Amino acid sequence: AKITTVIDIGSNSVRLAVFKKTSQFGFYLLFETKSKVRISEGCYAFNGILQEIPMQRAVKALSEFKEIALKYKSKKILCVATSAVRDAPNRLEFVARVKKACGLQIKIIDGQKEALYGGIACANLLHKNSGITIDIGGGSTECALIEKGKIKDLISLDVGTIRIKEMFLDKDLDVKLAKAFIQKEVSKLPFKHKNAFGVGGTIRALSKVLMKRFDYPIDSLHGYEIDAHKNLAFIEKIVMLKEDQLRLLGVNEERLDSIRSGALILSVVLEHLKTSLMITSGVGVREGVFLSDLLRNHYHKFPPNINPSLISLKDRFLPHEKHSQKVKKECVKLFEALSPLHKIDEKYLFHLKIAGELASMGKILSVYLAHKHSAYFILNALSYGFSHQDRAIICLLAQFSHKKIPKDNAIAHMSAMMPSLLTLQWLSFILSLAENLCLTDSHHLKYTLEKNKLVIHSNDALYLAKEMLPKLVKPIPLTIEFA
Amino acid sequence: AKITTVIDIGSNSVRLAVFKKTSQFGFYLLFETKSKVRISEGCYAFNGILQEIPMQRAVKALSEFKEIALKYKSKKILCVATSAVRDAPNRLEFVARVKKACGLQIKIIDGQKEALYGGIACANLLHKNSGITIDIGGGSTECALIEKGKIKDLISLDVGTIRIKEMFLDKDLDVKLAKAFIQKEVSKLPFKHKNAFGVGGTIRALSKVLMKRFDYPIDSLHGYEIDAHKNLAFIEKIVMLKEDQLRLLGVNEERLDSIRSGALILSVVLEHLKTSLMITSGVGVREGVFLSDLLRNHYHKFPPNINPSLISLKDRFLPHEKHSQKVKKECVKLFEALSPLHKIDEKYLFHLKIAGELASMGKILSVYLAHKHSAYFILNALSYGFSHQDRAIICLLAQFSHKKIPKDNAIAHMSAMMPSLLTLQWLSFILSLAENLCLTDSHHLKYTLEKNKLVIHSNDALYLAKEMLPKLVKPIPLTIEFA
Ligand SMILES: Nc1nc2c(ncn2[C@@H]2O[C@H](COP(=O)(O)OP(=O)(O)OP(O)(O)=S)[C@@H](O)[C@H]2O)c(=O)[nH]1
Ligand SMILES: Nc1nc2c(ncn2[C@@H]2O[C@H](COP(=O)(O)OP(=O)(O)OP(O)(O)=S)[C@@H](O)[C@H]2O)c(=O)[nH]1
Ligand SMILES: [Cl-]
Ligand SMILES: [Cl-]
Ligand SMILES: [Cl-]
Ligand SMILES: [K+]
Ligand SMILES: [K+]
Ligand SMILES: [Mg+2]
Ligand SMILES: [Mg+2]
Ligand SMILES: [Mg+2]
Ligand SMILES: [Mg+2]
């Protein structure tokens, strides 16, 4: 199927995502949305029986999600339902009402399969290979243990934002009683890990709060890294704030009434898992469902050196992809030839290579200021499998090809672990020279270094590359000569 | 063909552009560059005989231009040569040298054909119907009188930057004698007009100086508007400035030694033509050659309401047109139904409709912050046939969909002729509401207004559009009801 829709019927949000497959492993999100259906509303006092008005909302929302699926030409529609529906004594009647109302067939999935879908999404689309997912939803919480990219254990707990809200916080029961109820279940998690992968609306909402509080310069939550020890006190503080204080923190209206129980659950989980770093995930069940299919014949794992963001970016914006292979190759040779001078950690060849592949991507928008467009593309869409640092470096290399990187760059100082200006200027200068040298179909280039003299060996005239040489911004005083 | 390279052998710059046809009328630039070949160097003192080292440069640049054309898989290569080559007693040996060196067939064109090509580009790719082109090159200056989109007269004058530089300025001849010489040729221009279309490197260079001088917020040469009366004195001053003063003004190193001649010629032309408004053209001879082929069967003119930037942007990023056509339709209806309240000039329906078509273009990059990506695409690539004002308005409409436009927005204050903030907030709100209503293919919507009450008439549940109603930002107090 070229276009596939996933519908994730949660206990609070119902989510929709439309995926377009661009190659064997390349894909991107054509459309996504979520609706605050809260099918679980009022069910927890009636033995999980889904109530009439909430069921009516679900049907109406699901009908429009189906319309959206067909509006985008989906060849397949996969619909899964989690905690509130699987717990519900009348679950089979709701499934039947939905089928009769719109022809959608719902597959109730158990907690372990829900944990797996979140694990699959995070194991493949984040930048850490090992860790534990935390998928806090309105009705349940899933944790999947991931080790070097493979799922090793799945657990689902019957604690969720709306469950806690209706059983405890709505009744003005002391928050201590809710914490105990949560801890009693969180005790059952049989594993610990320095890394956690934060999944779901509570955690993404909390991540937006933290980004705003610390004036974070990158506006995308997929991959945002949270120091769990530093921030656990604030997370616990959120549990007891009132609605207007949450508003001042930036929480949107629709999320005000569930975020505090959600924050309580997250705090108990993080304490138990001994998490030190939580990475915010922009993906979860709906993406994992799609990947279960995409990767069904590949053991639910992208092959080594297969990155779906990189690949889909090239399918969308660079389908004649040999030029960029040459620039990458020359960037490698240049980096080796100059290593006596720059002595930069070869870990940064990773970023240089990718900037080599992507630096002319923005010409599909305009050939004027093309590198500025490439940088924009890279910063906003090179997401799966890249840290924010990885993205910022690659972005800067492309953005400042043939230019001086400012001292005052927000992205460059995004973190104290970022590479130095000089290192960034070196890699950008290398990218620039490689680009100049690959302008034509010049072949068999060789670089030698003697003192501060770079010599470019070629039997080609390289007339245009020689003409452009003075427009390079060198990282240090260095002479470039053509032999 | 699909991919077409054009090479324009000027007397100073030699330019290359690779065009990609995406549809019957859609196209965009795959690649472009220019090389300071200056084939005319030293020819003016030897009756126009092209000199040996300049010809060698040309052969070396043109052989690599051919390589670039083939690298991009050009099916057709169109190569024309202008003043210095057409004037040269040895023109036929240079042409044959180039043919033997790389198989490029140079077609020497006379001054009228040169004026025609610039005219075709400007008549089609600029936003004014009538005016006179001013194409100052190294050897000659062309003017094409355009009226209502149609070429009515062509003249070529033997004044250019390198000609004047070598005949007068290089010899420390009083600038007065050079002006007198130019005035004698400009005298032959038999027409006048309030509008001028600026073509070539001199005028683009001057436009960049002016954009920097005035802290202009849109970094885009194409379409930039220059008050010729207010700036003529500054243009004339440029003629008397030193290299380093030109550097301080931002002039590129390669442009320093020709811009003063070019400014002298331009000031004389603007005075004679009575120009009050000059529009900087990002296109010229090379685009005119491509268009004369593209439009060979359409009398060198796009059909009414055919805009190649709009179309090509949709070809590249929106190969599915029916969604965006629905949003535009609702934007028109909403506009008309709300006009008792907003009372906005109907001239702005033009921008609203195009924002309706393009507002979700950016989702091809990311579905998160998609409207921000769309605005970026529009501001940087919606160029042919649009003023900077048109581009800015359309950009802002998409950018601030479902948001409040800040009071201090740089683009919004780009010029005093911009629409008011309130008008802009109105248009954005209409777009936002249209977008909500077209989420699903809600068919046959109708609108009525009573006082400040908008009533939406539908047979649809419009469940999701209602769920989103509170996130619209209204321009004035307004009640929205569904019947
Ligand atoms: N699952 C997931 N949600 C995200 C991600 N990034 C943002 N969100 C959330 O998704 C919702 C939509 O954000 P966003 O897409 O930026 O606005 P929008 O309503 O679709 O309007 P737009 O994108 O056309 S500008 C917000 O609630 C945001 O907090 C992500 O990477 N993954
Ligand atoms: N003919 C034409 N030239 C332009 C236009 N805009 C800018 N230029 C000129 O073309 C040259 C390159 O512009 P530009 O493409 O932004 O830099 P670049 O060297 O190619 O580097 P990049 O685009 O990969 S970031 C400069 O001489 C600039 O003034 C335009 O619209 N038309
Ligand atoms: Cl979310
Ligand atoms: Cl130019
Ligand atoms: Cl030009
Ligand atoms: K969950
Ligand atoms: K000219
Ligand atoms: Mg869930
Ligand atoms: Mg460019
Ligand atoms: Mg010319
Ligand atoms: Mg979005």
Domain ranges of chain B: 1-109, 110-293, 294-483
Ligand 2 atom having least distance to the Cα of A360: 24
Cβ of A306 under 8 Å from any chain B Cβ? no
CB spacing of B367 vs A63 below 8 angstroms: no
**Three-state SS annotation for A282-315:** CCCHHHHHHHHHHCCCCCCCCCCCCCHHHHHHHH
Q: How many CB atoms lie within 10 A of CB B236?
A: 17
Cβ of A321 under 8 Å from any chain B Cβ? no
CB spacing of A461 vs B60 below 8 angstroms: yes
Nearest to B6 by CA among B93, B87, B74, B79: B79
Q: How many residues does chain B have?
A: 483
CA atoms within 13 A on the CB side of B315: 16
Radius of gyration of chain A (CA): 25
Collapsing DSSP to helix, strand or coil, A156 comes out as: strand
Cβ of A443 under 8 Å from any chain B Cβ? no
Q: How far apart are the C-alpha atoms of A61 and A35, rounded to whole Å?
A: 7
Provide the β-strand partners of residue A14.
A9, A35
Q: Are A157 and A191 in contact (CB under 8 A)?
A: no
Nearest to A30 by CA among A88, A79, A86, A70: A70
* Parallel/antiparallel/unpaired status of strands A453-457 and A446-450: antiparallel
Cβ neighbours for A25, distance < 8 A, ≥ 6 positions apart: A294, A302, A303, A306, A308, A311
Chain B CA closest to residue A313: B365
Q: How many CB atoms lie within 10 A of CB B293?
A: 16
Cβ of A123 under 8 Å from any chain B Cβ? no
Cβ neighbours for A185, distance < 8 A, ≥ 6 positions apart: A141, A157, A158, A159
Collapsing DSSP to helix, strand or coil, A343 comes out as: coil
Q: How many CB atoms lie within 10 A of CB B47?
A: 9
Residue with tokens 């039947």: A96
Q: Are B368 and A220 in contact (CB under 8 A)?
A: yes
Question: Which of B31, B56, B64, B372 has the highest number of chain A CBs within 10 A, making it the mutation to test binding with A?
Answer: B64
Collapsing DSSP to helix, strand or coil, B286 comes out as: helix
How big is the CA angle at A368 (ends A367 and A374), to the nearest 5 degrees? 70
Nearest to A115 by CA among A93, A75, A79, A83: A83
Cβ of A99 under 8 Å from any chain B Cβ? no
Nearest to B355 by CA among B336, B322, B380, B332: B332
CB nearest to B470's CB, from A219, A253, A383: A253
Q: Are B463 and B447 in contact (CB under 8 A)?
A: no
- The amino acid that residue B36 corresponds to is K
Crossing angle for the helix pair B370-381 and A370-381, to the nearest 10 degrees:
170
- Name the region of B411 (left: φ>0; alpha: ψ -120 to 50; beta: rest): alpha
Q: How far apart are the C-alpha atoms of B426 and B400, rounded to whole Å?
A: 11
Q: Are A441 and A328 in contact (CB under 8 A)?
A: no
Structure tokens at B464: 């999701």
Q: How many CB atoms lie within 10 A of CB B320?
A: 11
Nearest to B381 by CA among B437, B470, B447, B313: B313
Separation of A95 CA from ligand 11 center, angstroms?
29
Cβ of B33 under 8 Å from any chain A Cβ? yes
Distance of CA B166 to the CA centre of its chain: 31
Chain A CA closest to residue B18: A367
Structure tokens at B295: 């439009």
Q: How many residues does chain A have?
A: 483
Q: How far apart are the C-alpha atoms of B389 and B351, rounded to whole Å?
A: 10
Q: How far apart are the C-alpha atoms of A224 and A206, rounded to whole Å?
A: 11
Q: How far apart are the C-alpha atoms of A58 and A200, rounded to whole Å?
A: 19
Separation of A9 CA from ligand 8 center, angstroms?
7
CB spacing of B219 vs A63 below 8 angstroms: no
Measuring CA to CA, how many Å separate A458 from each of A429, A437, A448, B57, B66? 20, 10, 12, 19, 19
Q: Are B6 and B50 in contact (CB under 8 A)?
A: no
B61 to chain A: which residues are within 8 Å by CB? Answer: 463-464
* Parallel/antiparallel/unpaired status of strands A3-9 and A14-21: antiparallel
Helix (H) or strand (E) holding B466: helix B463-467
Cβ neighbours for B117, distance < 8 A, ≥ 6 positions apart: B80, B109, B284, B285, B288, B289, B292
A296 among annotated binding-site residues: no
Pick the residue whose CA is nearest to atom 8 on ligand 1: B368
Q: Are A221 and A282 in contact (CB under 8 A)?
A: yes
DSSP for residue A281: P
Cβ neighbours for B241, distance < 8 A, ≥ 6 positions apart: B249, B260
B177/chain A closest Cα distance in angstroms: 34
Q: How far apart are the C-alpha atoms of B413 and B323, rounded to whole Å?
A: 32
Beta strands in B214-271 (DSSP E): 225-227
Ligand 2 atom having least distance to the Cα of A371: 25
Neighbours of ion ligand 7 (CB under 5 A): B 135, 137, 140
A268/chain B closest Cα distance in angstroms: 30
- Touching B: A residues 248-287, CB under 8 Å: 253, 282
Q: Are B270 and B228 in contact (CB under 8 A)?
A: yes
Binding-site residues of B: 12-13, 15, 34, 72, 114, 128-130, 135, 194-195, 201, 204, 255, 286, 323, 367
Cβ neighbours for B311, distance < 8 A, ≥ 6 positions apart: B22, B23, B25, B26
Cβ of B441 under 8 Å from any chain A Cβ? yes
Pick the residue whose CA is nearest to atom 3 on ligand 1: A282
Instruction: From B358, B365, B368, give the residue whose CB has the most ligand 1 atoms within 8 Å, as the site to mutate.
Output: B368
Q: Are B40 and B113 in contact (CB under 8 A)?
A: no
Pick the residue whose CA is nearest to atom 13 on ligand 1: B368
CB spacing of A380 vs B363 below 8 angstroms: no
Structure tokens at B86: 């057409």
Q: How many CB atoms lie within 10 A of CB B209?
A: 19
Query: Long-range pairs for B336-341 at CB < 8 Å and ≥24 separation?
Result: B337/B447, B337/B448, B337/B449, B337/B454, B338/B426, B338/B430, B338/B447, B338/B449, B338/B454, B340/B449, B341/B449, B341/B452, B341/B476, B341/B478
Q: How far apart are the C-alpha atoms of B326 and B438, rounded to whole Å?
A: 7
How big is the CA angle at B463 (ends B459 and B469), to the nearest 5 degrees? 110
* Parallel/antiparallel/unpaired status of strands A225-227 and B107-108: unpaired
B6 to chain A: which residues are within 8 Å by CB? Answer: none
Collapsing DSSP to helix, strand or coil, B19 comes out as: strand
Nearest to A261 by CA among A198, A170, A186: A170
Quick one: resolution in A?
A: 2.1
* Parallel/antiparallel/unpaired status of strands B14-21 and B27-35: antiparallel
Q: How far apart are the C-alpha atoms of B287 and B19, rounded to whole Å?
A: 9
> What DSSP string describes B146-175?
EETTEEEEEEEES--HHHHHHHTGGGT--H
Q: How far apart are the C-alpha atoms of A234 and A231, rounded to whole Å?
A: 5
> What DSSP string describes B401-432?
TTSPPPTT-TGGGS-TTSPPHHHHHHHHHHHH
Q: How far apart are the C-alpha atoms of B330 and A269, rounded to whole Å?
A: 48
Nearest to A412 by CA among A400, A429, A401: A400
Structure tokens at B26: 């859609």
Ligand 1 atom having least distance to the Cα of B371: 25
Q: Are B18 and B4 in contact (CB under 8 A)?
A: yes
φ/ψ of A16, rounded to 5, equals -130, 140
Pick the residue whose CA is nearest to atom 2 on ligand 2: B282
Cβ of A150 under 8 Å from any chain B Cβ? no
CB nearest to A220's CB, from B63, B368, B463: B368
Residue with tokens 């991540």: A207
Residue with tokens 């934060």: A198
Residue with tokens 């809600």: B442
- The amino acid that residue B283 corresponds to is V
Q: How many CB atoms lie within 10 A of CB A351?
A: 23
Determination method here?
X-ray
Helices (H) and strands (E) in chain A, counts: 18, 14
Binding-site residues of B for (S)-malate: 12-13, 128-130, 194-195, 201, 204, 255, 286
Cβ of B102 under 8 Å from any chain A Cβ? no
φ/ψ of B198, rounded to 5, equals -80, 120
Helices (H) and strands (E) in chain B, counts: 18, 14
Q: How many CB atoms lie within 10 A of CB B45?
A: 12
Buried b (16+ CB within 10 A) or exposed e, A92-122: eebbebbeeeeebebebbebebbbbbbbbbb
Buried b (16+ CB within 10 A) or exposed e, B59-96: bbbbbbbbbbbebbebeebbbbbbbbbbbbebbeebbe
> What DSSP string describes B66-118?
HHHHHHTT-SEEEEEE-HHHHH-TTHHHHHHHHHHHH----EE--HHHHHHHH
